[PDB]
Amino acid sequence: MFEKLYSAIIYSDEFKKILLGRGVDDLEIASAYIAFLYEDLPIIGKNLCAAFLRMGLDAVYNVMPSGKVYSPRHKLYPISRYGIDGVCINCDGGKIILRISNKGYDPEDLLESKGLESRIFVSKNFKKKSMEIIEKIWDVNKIRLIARKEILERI
């Protein structure tokens, strides 16, 4: 059920390393979990992992210099914008605001929440926990190599 989520995280991590020289961060990873739960919710702010979930490899065409994605058709926006509302990733410009906190959801518990509150809190080490799970189940080095090759053919 979750293959698209794991692949979005690996592909976005490899793409960000190619473009900006660093991997995706905790909030960017959390955006893919939110996008996995709410297909119709605009995601505003740190959203690269959500973009690979919604757009696949086509996400590479819509990345801003900041590493955030602009794609109205997929309800992805890099900054607060007139006429859009949704979840603002670690920003105040939204009717739902997502932040990191000590008592925030771990990845698995986030995916089990039934209900969209106005304030979403995710645990610290969100990336670490997501990445530990994926390396446990998949041959991540092999997938990373395929992802890099496929990304570079589009770039």
Numbering used by the authors: 1 to 155
What does the paper say about this structure?
Genome segregation is a fundamental process that preserves the genetic integrity of all organisms, but the mechanisms driving genome segregation in archaea remain enigmatic. SegC has a tertiary structure folding similar to those of the ThDP-binding fold superfamily, but SegC shares only 5–15% sequence identity with those proteins. Surprisingly, we found that SSO0033 exhibits nucleotide triphosphatase (NTPase) activity and assembles into filaments in the presence of nucleoside triphosphates (NTPs) and DNA.
During the crystallization trials, we also observed another crystal form under different condition after a couple of months of crystal screening. The r.m.s.d. between the SegCm and SegC monomers is 0.42 Å (in Cα), implying that the overall structure does not change much. The loss of the C-terminal region of SegCm (residues 155–165) may result in an inability to form the AB dimer interface, thereby disrupting dimer formation. To confirm that the missing C-terminus was not due to a flexibility issue, we dissolved SegCm crystals and measured their molecular weight by mass spectrometry. The results of mass spectrometry showed two main peaks for the SegCm crystal of 18038.6 Da and 18143.8 Da, which were significantly smaller than the molecular weight peak for SegC (19859.7 Da). This difference in molecular weight corresponds to a peptide of approximately fourteen residues (including six his-tag), implying that residues after Gly159 are degraded during crystallization. Thus, the extreme C-terminal region of SegC is crucial for dimer formation, as its degradation destroys the AB dimer interface, preventing dimer assembly and even further affecting the genesis of multimers.
